[PDB]
Design a binder for these strands. Structure first.
Ligand code: ZN
Lengths: 550, 318, 145, 244
DNA sequence: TACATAA
């Protein structure tokens, strides 16, 4: 049924709600709230060596558990009961969380945390970590860890502070909240009766000025230095505008949801003098909180931890036991080794596209994926089962000669072949990591003059009638077709299609379905021209249609 | 929902509130009484307050029905489902009660209008008004009632609409959304809607901190048998609210003892579940505390105990 | 007890083997069953490892490990295939460091009352490990029920 | 054929241009009512044969020549944003020029050289069909690459692709944020870790559709139990909430 | 070996 599947997951979340409510209402002292002078002094620096030892207060709540174990219901209840800001580490996670929340009761659009604290396009290509930092105090204090995390993230943090303090129009302090407070003081009204209406009147205010409870889903896919930056950004965003929560001395509460075991983060670096990319493993936020002694004592993680056990997906006994053994690091016996022997299959069996049709193959490298995709495309071309025809499309990159000249002047490198540089930097020009798994042909280079550009053209091979995913925004336009009459009537009866679009396109969307309905006629006789249907029934249909038209 | 103001300080028993509330919804759909004070309300969260759970509904205006014609129209609207014409609401509108709500918002909108730049330093010969005198005069010259609101609507309709559509977030929803969220059954569509949207915050019991799905699951076991209505609603009619309003207002679950005893059962069921859950959790935690046993056997114990306490057969029996 | 009452009883290796008229004890029955099953093993190794073809032309089966749920037999090449030690089927090792890989057939229950036969190898090379047993592939054998 | 061979309702009905929201709603409602009535009549007439018959309605004249889609002008159709969580089916490529996409590419990018170099030799747009069955042209994936060296930022490269990925083969690390149905893992001996194996075999809800080239438990693997110990020690803490 | 953020 559906009633007993939520019994244990609806009476066990109330303590979580009570603890988050108690955490989110604690008031600091007047001497611990970061002042605007802190960020003004930070923005007036050149190297992260003049950073003083200051602490940014915060609190955390951990909600950890395996994938599919039911933390989404906890987040749903938190959103429905509390006044929180729900975010996501990636766009896929944000979209999934928005789908769940909007399917439960109601939700605002959900954005990533990077968009929440102001991560712009340029900050993507910053050199994360160049100034050495050595811990001084043993054991380390909170201020030392915060300073280390700020030094690691120096470029992005400095750019964020500079942009935030420069977008204020000079020395003129932002008047989104100050005018309302002044009117409150003059008119003799209750505190917060007028300032809290500022988000209603102004629609450009950031979400960090609206609530102090920030829910981060899939917190394991994040660097540990993002545990401080967020908090830092929060204080900055609440120091500029003099938000009512800042005047009430409230601290940010970060509710992290994710699985610490089957999820990790990576750090990449580029050596220009060698044209090399090196990727290593680092600590995520969950491991940073769970393992570090200082953060464990500061955040009181014993009283702020909720572990979700039991899996709604696993339905096998031996597989479940093996999964439990793997997750908790239990000793591996010989019975497990004998059990896993069922799935062993020769490598040539897997790599051959003929065997196991329609299965997803996981490799440990991009070259293997590319080779398998090329083999699959070649096999589909010759041994065609039909309904899928393999075609190719052009793709191209433009390089500016002046920028390359500046780059070579800065980075020595007396000679630099276009092909060699593009091959070495093939993992950074693109905006998605699946570009290295695409079947590509011979790479061609040419020099286009009067534009002072270099064009690198290639071909990418695709399979017709295949299920694929779009890994970008990629605004699209719909222009008709519905497959079958049943689907057309299903989409006509339901108005959810209009609601899926934004609340600005309804009128001409309705216009578009109206013209689709108009153009959907004719060719009904072709259906009536199906082989051997009837003779008199056609005349009966004629009469019925004429009567309906009349 | 209908309620009467309480003057008796002694806490009524469960059997007293049920009889008091059942006497309101008589067996005609229309509430008893000679005068009514109705608060017309919309979806949206209230700001500036602090409660256990954030508000789900925000009042929009207030009307008073005391005359015979107005009372008859209100009873017809509440019983059968005939919509209220704007003439009746305009005539019965309670001006100061509704415009005490739209007093801070008008001030905020006026401040946002005039926030271009407060130079107030023109000097000249007679235009040397003080740095704070211009703002004081402008604030004091704004009527925080009907005149200010209508002037703002006439001059700045687009921005006023955009601002009012943000404080009342979610107030514009289609009937299909209401049918899909709070539905699909008639009993759910009536009782769950009325409790979750209106009575949960007002009563403020132990059920004020439960989500929509939990309230629906609780209502699932509220098994008042039936009374088969002649006809039901169908598709292609959810374009307008008239069909769903007529369906809900003439329902068996919107009046009588069926609607007079749902919050009491919600509290009873919540308490009954918590009584067992807390004890079982305490047992499991105490056995967890010491348990000087190896890791593999500890995991075995944890999963075995959690399965034995809340196995699906035991949940079904409970 | 909960697992038995929830997921059902699982057959032991003895009953499944007896379903093929083969007893784990007495030695000879297991070796005869392996002799019958060898055809599928050589067919699979020919299909997927074509370079190692003549090594398995004439092989003999000898019991190595007998247990309640797992039976391991050794595949000796009837002492008449010139190459005394079979080569490793995973990697190409050095010329001097001959891959003296011993090959085994492992019988277990596995799936729902079916039978699982697997090929295993022990290679004393420095690249693989030695002392360690590597499973190469597993083929279903349950058909003559 | 008979005299009424072309659904003479066309000659008797003129769908004039719409008007304000109320008029749009009325015209849409009447057209929908007529279409629903015709659908009901022809469904009652035939049944399942009519229900599963192929249906194809397009705003303009659309021709499918092999793998290419040919249309005169892509005028008419709502704009939307393609979601990475939605499932699309590849249908082909078209060379039809969309004014909105070109204008957006001009506006968003300050580099006009890329803009008119793409204008002179335009890439084909990709047509995809959603789960419901709505054909849509998707804009090309255009990416900027600005390199930051020391304290110097240079807008160096501009890439132009289609930004579509096939769910047939992927890396193990990429699969840690996905859920799959049938999985055939291909480990590499020498650098095998138990965490990678756990992530790989954790992607399938059942073991009936799992395959691998080697036994990850019988080989040499790297074990780093620093988090599992902390989690197990947390399960013995009376202050830690546990939800079943 | 190896992924995300930008919009
Ligand atoms: Zn070997």
């Amino acid at each position: 049924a559906e009633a007993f599947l939520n019994f244990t997951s609806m009476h066990g979340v109330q303590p979580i709600l009570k603890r988050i409510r108690e955490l989110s209402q604690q008031q600091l002292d007047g001497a611990q709230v970061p002042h605007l002078q802190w960020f003004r002094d930070v923005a007036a620096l050149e190297s992260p060596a003049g950073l003083p030892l200051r602490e940014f207060p915060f609190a955390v709540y951990l909600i950890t558990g395996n994938a599919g174990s039911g933390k989404s219901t906890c987040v749903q209840t938190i959103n429905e009961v509390l006044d929180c800001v729900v975010t996501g580490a990636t766009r896929i996670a944000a979209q999934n969380m928005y789908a769940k929340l909007s399917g439960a009761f109601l939700s605002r659009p959900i954005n990533t945390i990077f968009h929440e604290f102001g991560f712009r396009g340029n900050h993507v290509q910053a050199q994360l970590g160049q100034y050495p930092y050595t811990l001084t105090s043993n054991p380390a204090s909170l201020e030392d860890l915060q300073r280390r995390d700020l030094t690691y993230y120096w470029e992005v943090i400095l750019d964020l502070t500079k942009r935030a303090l420069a977008a204020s129009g000079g020395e003129e302090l932002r008047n989104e909240f100050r005018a309302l407070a002044a009117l409150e003081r003059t008119l003799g009204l209750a505190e917060g009766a007028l300032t809290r209406l500022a988000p209603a009147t102004h629609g450009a205010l950031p979400a960090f000025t609206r609530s102090n409870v920030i829910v981060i889903d899939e917190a394991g896919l994040l660097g540990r230095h993002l545990l401080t930056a967020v908090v830092y950004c929060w204080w900055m965003i609440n120091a500029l505008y003099h938000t009512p929560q800042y005047a009430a001395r409230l601290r940010p509460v970060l509710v992290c949801v994710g699985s610490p075991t089957q999820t990790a983060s990576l750090e990449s670096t580029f050596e220009h003098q060698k044209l090399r990319c090196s990727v290593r493993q680092s600590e995520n936020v969950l491991t940073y909180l769970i393992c570090n002694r200082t953060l464990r004592e500061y955040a009181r993680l014993s009283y702020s931890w909720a572990i979700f056990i039991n899996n709604k997906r696993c339905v096998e006994h031996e597989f479940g036991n093996l999964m439990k053994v793997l997750e908790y690091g239990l000793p591996i016996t010989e019975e497990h080794m004998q059990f896993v022997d069922r799935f062993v299959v020769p490598e040539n069996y897997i790599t051959n596209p003929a065997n196991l049709p329609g299965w997803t193959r996981l490799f440990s490298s991009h070259k293997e994926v590319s080779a398998y995709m090329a083999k699959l495309h070649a096999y589909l071309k010759v041994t065609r089962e039909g309904e899928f025809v393999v075609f190719t499309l052009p793709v191209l990159t433009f390089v500016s000669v002046k920028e390359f000249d500046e780059y070579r002047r800065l980075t020595h490198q007396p000679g630099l072949t276009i092909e060699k540089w593009l091959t070495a930097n093939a993992s950074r020009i693109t905006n998605y990591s699946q570009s290295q798994d695409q079947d590509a042909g011979h790479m061609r280079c040419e020099v286009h003059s009067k534009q002072q550009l270099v064009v690198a053209r290639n071909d990418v091979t695709y399979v017709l009638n295949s299920q694929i995913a779009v890994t970008a925004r990629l605004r699209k336009l719909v222009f008709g077709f519905s497959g079958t009459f049943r689907a057309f009537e299903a989409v006509l009866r339901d108005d959810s299609f209009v609601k899926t679009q934004g609340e600005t396109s309804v009128e001409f969307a309705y216009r578009f379905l109206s013209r689709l309905i108009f153009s959907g006629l004719i060719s009904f006789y072709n259906f009536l021209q199906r082989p051997g249907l009837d003779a008199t029934q056609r005349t009966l249909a004629y009469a019925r249609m004429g009567e309906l038209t009349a | 929902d209908a309620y009467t103001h309480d003057g008796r300080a002694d806490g009524p028993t469960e059997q007293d509130r049920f009889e008091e509330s059942r006497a309101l919804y008589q067996a005609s759909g229309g509430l008893n009484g000679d005068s009514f004070r109705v608060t017309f309300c919309l979806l949206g969260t209230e700001v500036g307050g602090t409660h256990q759970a954030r508000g789900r509904t925000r009042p929009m205006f207030v009307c008073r029905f005391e005359r015979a014609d107005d009372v008859a129209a209100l009873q017809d609207a509440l019983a059968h489902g005939t919509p209220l014409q704007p003439d009746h609401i305009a005539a019965t509108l309670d001006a100061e009660a509704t415009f005490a709500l739209h007093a801070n918002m008008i001030l905020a909108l006026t401040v946002a209008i005039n926030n271009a730049s407060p130079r107030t330093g023109r000097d000249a010969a007679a235009a040397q008004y003080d740095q704070g005198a211009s703002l004081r005069s402008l604030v004091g010259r704004t009527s925080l009632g009907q005149r200010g609101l209508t002037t703002l609507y006439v001059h700045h309709e687009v921005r006023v609409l955009a601002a009012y559509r943000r404080a009342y977030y979610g107030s514009a929803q289609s009937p299909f959304w209401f049918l899909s969220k709070f539905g699909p059954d008639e009993k759910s569509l009536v009782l769950t809607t009325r409790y979750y949207l209106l009575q949960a915050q007002r009563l403020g019991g132990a059920g004020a901190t439960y989500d929509l799905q939990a309230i629906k699951d609780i209502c699932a076991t509220y098994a008042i048998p039936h009374a088969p209505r002649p006809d039901t609603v169908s598709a292609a009619s959810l374009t307008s609210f008239a069909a769903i309003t007529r369906f809900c207002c003439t329902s068996q679950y919107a009046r009588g003892a069926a609607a007079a005893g749902f919050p009491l059962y919600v509290e009873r069921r919540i308490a009954a579940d918590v009584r067992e859950t807390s004890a079982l959790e305490k047992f499991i935690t105490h056995d967890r505390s010491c348990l000087r046993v190896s890791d593999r056997e500890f995991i075995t114990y944890i999963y075995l105990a959690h399965f034995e306490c809340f196995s699906p057969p035991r949940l079904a029996t409970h | 007890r909960n697992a038995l009452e929830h997921f059902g009883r699982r057959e032991t290796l003895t009953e499944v083997l007896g379903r093929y008229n083969v007893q784990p004890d007495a030695g000879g029955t297991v070796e005869g069953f392996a002799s019958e099953l060898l055809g599928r093993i050589v067919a699979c190794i020919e299909t997927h490892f074509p370079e190692h073809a003549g090594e398995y032309q004439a092989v003999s089966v000898r019991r190595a490990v007998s247990k309640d749920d797992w039976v391991l037999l050794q595949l000796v090449p009837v002492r008449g295939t010139l190459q005394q030690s079979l080569s490793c089927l995973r990697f190409k090792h050095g010329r001097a460091s001959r891959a003296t890989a011993r090959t085994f057939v492992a019988l277990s229950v596995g799936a729902n009352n079916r039978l699982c036969v697997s090929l295993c190898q022990q290679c004393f090379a420095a690249k693989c490990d030695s002392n360690r047993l590597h499973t190469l592939f597993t083929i279903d054998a349950g058909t003559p029920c | 054929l008979d005299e009424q061979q072309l659904d003479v309702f066309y000659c008797h009905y003129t769908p004039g241009e719409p008007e304000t929201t109320a008029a749009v709603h009325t015209q849409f409602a009447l057209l929908k009512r007529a279409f629903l009535g015709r659908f009901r009549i022809l469904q009652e007439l035939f049944g399942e044969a009519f229900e599963v018959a192929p249906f194809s309605t397009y705003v303009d004249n659309v021709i499918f020549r092999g793998c290419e889609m040919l249309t005169g002008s892509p005028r008419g159709g709502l704009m939307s944003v393609a979601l990475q969580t939605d499932n699309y089916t590849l249908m082909g490529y078209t060379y039809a020029r969309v004014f909105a996409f070109a204008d957006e590419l001009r506006r968003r990018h300050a580099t006009a050289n890329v803009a008119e170099l793409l204008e002179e030799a335009p890439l084909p747009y990709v047509v995809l069909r959603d789960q419901h069955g709505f054909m849509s042209v998707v804009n090309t994936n255009i990416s900027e690459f600005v390199e930051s060296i020391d304290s110097t930022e240079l807008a160096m490269a501009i890439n132009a692709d289609y930004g579509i990925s096939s769910k047939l083969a992927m890396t193990i690390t990429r699969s840690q944020g996905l859920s799959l149905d049938k999985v055939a893992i291909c480990f590499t001996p020498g650098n095998l870790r138990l965490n990678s194996a756990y992530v790989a075999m954790s992607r399938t809800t059942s073991s009936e559709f799992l395959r691998m080239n080697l036994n990850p438990l019988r080989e040499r693997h790297e074990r780093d139990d620093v988090i599992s110990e902390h989690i197990l020690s947390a399960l013995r803490d009376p202050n830690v909430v546990i939800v079943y």
